Design a protein around this nucleic acid. Structure first.
Lengths: 79, 58
RNA sequence: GCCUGGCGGCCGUAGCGCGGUGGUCCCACCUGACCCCAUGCCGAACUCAGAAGUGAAACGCCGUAGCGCCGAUGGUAGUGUGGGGUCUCCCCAUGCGAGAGUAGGGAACUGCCAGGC
RNA sequence: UCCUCCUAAAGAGUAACGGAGGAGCACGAAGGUUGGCUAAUCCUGGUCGGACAUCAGGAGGUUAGUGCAAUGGCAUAAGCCAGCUUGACUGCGAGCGUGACGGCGCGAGCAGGUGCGAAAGCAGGUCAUAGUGAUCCGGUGGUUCUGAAUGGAAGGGCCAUCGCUCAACGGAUAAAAGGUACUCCGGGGAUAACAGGCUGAUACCGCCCAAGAGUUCAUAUCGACGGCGGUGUUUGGCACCU
RNA sequence: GGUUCUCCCCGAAAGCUAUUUAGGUAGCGCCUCGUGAAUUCAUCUCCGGGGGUAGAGCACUGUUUCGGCAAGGGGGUCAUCCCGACUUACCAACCCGAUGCAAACUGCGAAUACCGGAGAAUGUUAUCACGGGAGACACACGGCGGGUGCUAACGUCCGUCGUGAAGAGGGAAACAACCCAGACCGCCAGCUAAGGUCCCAAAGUCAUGGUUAAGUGGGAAACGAUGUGGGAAGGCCCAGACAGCCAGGAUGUUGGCUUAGAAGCAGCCAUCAUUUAAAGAAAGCGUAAUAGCUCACUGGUCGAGUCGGCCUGCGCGGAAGAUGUAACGGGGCUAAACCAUGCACCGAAGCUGCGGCAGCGACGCUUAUGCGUUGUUGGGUAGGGGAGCGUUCUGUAAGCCUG
RNA sequence: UUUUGUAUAAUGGGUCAGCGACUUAUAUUCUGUAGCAAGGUUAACCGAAUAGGGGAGCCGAAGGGAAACCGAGUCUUAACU
């Protein structure tokens, strides 16, 4: 019925893909809403607020598909 | 296996950039260049991707 | 080998239905309750002290190929690039290829420690 | 002007008065943290209770709750309570994400001072995404910055304190509204009208077909319903060449 | 709007974001010259990773058909004795058995794409920063992916592939954008593409196979006809079919049921037995009904395929419009129609051979620097950049040339 | 000539001739080129007006901070971090 106002800010979409790390900061993807689809495991934290895959220690991501029922993990391990 | 003699019939001028990149990866020029390509499955899969316009001899 | 407990891993081969099965061991009911502790009231919960009662509920294992679950081969839906046409479809060349079902698979497997035979 | 989802394409962007809803704040608590707990709904059954005030049990569900849009989160609870509590912390900051910038989110690291807890660990605000007004500036308190002859000082700066729906929102100036078929200027079928094209829903007609009319009988003649065309050709659509 | 003589090197856009913004301009995308340091990239295969479109689906949401059961609500009724009962066209919970729809749903989910490894192959001077300039931010079109429109427009709004924008040549009558291919410049040279070879107009009326029967080909729908070849069965079929011609059309039979009557003659039971040269309780027209018949069904005859559908192709009728044939370019037409494969010929600025030109590199021969072999970029508007030839001035120029 | 695009039924042209267009003025800087170099350069004017003087003035070699103030450091700062 016009206009419609629709909004125009942000895309809140993936950035951190494949085998990844972080020299001084590891952040992965910065995405809204996601707290129950894929979970952090190891040196990485989030689930605020924050929307990020921040790491408290040094290591690299490999992604995991194995887990209890619907759970899948964004696993981080040192080299 | 035996290596394969390649010739270009038709030209790629009207074809999509991905296929123009295949003809370039095969090293082909002025629709025929006296080229004979490696006996690998990897090059056979590169010939198969444009087989409607690349000619093959063994 | 076999039996169990914890952390768990894997997470349906780990499910359901129905049956079988254990108390040396561990496990739950069980048997009591000053003190530390707890109750808008309470040994109800949380918590402690233990062995008279039991293998029920609870906990754990297992037979059973009936269904779930996993699903080959063949075909199908769809589709990347190309040639045409009878044109939002069809025909051809050349590749990819589900979803469902079938046959087959499948009533798991396992890392660390500890107790028991 | 701010916020979200879908159309939107197994990254994002991505048009249509395409499809639909919200914001221009509020909570000192609904913040912090430690401990305990968790629905709905139906049925059964019982006084003071007029028809119904009780809660215990089963049947059963993460089909209850949350400041609100829609999206997604949330029981490890952010839901409901019990205590203690004010981290709704200060000045800062490697770095990452992000928009063209304004602006902003995330965050290792340092000191200082608080709070929960056995400790670990968490606390620089609420379940997240909307709650404003810059630049210019008037007024005011402070100021061991400065005021150009020297010493004070109007004044300028620094630091506190507040405000323009300027909302045409990214704001053209302590101060600005309407009308022109009386005009008039630059540009144009980029843009309408009288005509050229395209289309044929509309228009008039036929054919497939037939509820019925035509005292019988659907189809001589005529036709409600549904279908498929004949036409360029009007009423409109449309904005190419003018 | 007027904006200048000659050879070259690289090579855009009509997109993002803002603006008294939709005619301009400014940060990001796209173009370019210099300077310093330098390989820039993709296609193929597999592995791993974030992935929910296409397809699939009904579990959950919302919607929904069909069948059945149906709480409670909304409506109606009769009882108030029968354990109150009938009804659900409406609104709606439960439930048994099925089925449609979905951008806004999911007891499933590709192709492709994108990111990075592990690996092979090929070739472009690239990438990056700094220092200088820009141009554009009103384009148009064919196809594909989707909405919108009347499953209309040379209509509308986007995404997206390629082309016109800035692309010449061969083909589509004439044609921008569609088809073949991307043009450094030549050759009284070859070879092909799309397209084409009876004539207009260069080349097969080619070889061989497939199909229609007509001016189809050469405008055209739903619709309609024993127009008809092919495919798989069925029936009749060669001691004898379909059609034709001639010759045969009853005996049981005055059948039974319903009804308004009905000898086959609108319904129902059935649809056989018998004789022969030979036959329906009935096929059709018809009558008050028989009949009249014309037939069904056999015989003889002739004679080998044929009847109704199913399936798959190609044709016919379906078919009125305006300046003049006027819907294959026009003519011709029995293939001289369409279609497939083969080898020809004609076919481009494509490919090859040979000959010229500019830039930078390479191999070899040869030598007061020449000759062979060659890699390879050369269509360019906006715009960026390099270099030539003329014109004129000052000096040389009171030198030097000359009446 | 206009335009994405015109043989165009889109504006224009009778023809020949004399004509007709990107500069120098100033400041700063980028590039080029050169002299000098932690220095460079002069203006007006003087003067032997294309010499030589004239360095007034300007540009440059040190930064941090509103600024006071400090300086190979300095502002933020209790700070060292």
């Amino acid at each position: 019925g016009g206009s419609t106002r629709n909004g125009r800010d942000s895309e809140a979409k993936r950035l951190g893909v494949k085998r990844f790390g972080g020299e001084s900061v590891l952040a992965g993807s910065i995405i809204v809403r996601q707290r129950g689809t894929k979970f952090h495991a190891g040196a990485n934290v989030g689930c605020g607020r924050d929307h990020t895959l921040f790491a408290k220690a040094d290591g690299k991501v490999k992604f995991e598909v194995k887990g209890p029922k619907n759970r899948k993990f964004i696993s981080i391990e040192a080299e | 296996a035996k290596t394969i003699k390649i010739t270009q019939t038709r030209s790629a001028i009207g074809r999509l950039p991905k296929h123009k990149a295949t003809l370039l990866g095969l090293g082909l020029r002025r629709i025929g260049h006296t080229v004979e390509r490696e006996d690998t499955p990897a090059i056979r899969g590169m010939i198969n991707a444009v087989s409607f316009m690349v000619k093959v001899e063994e």
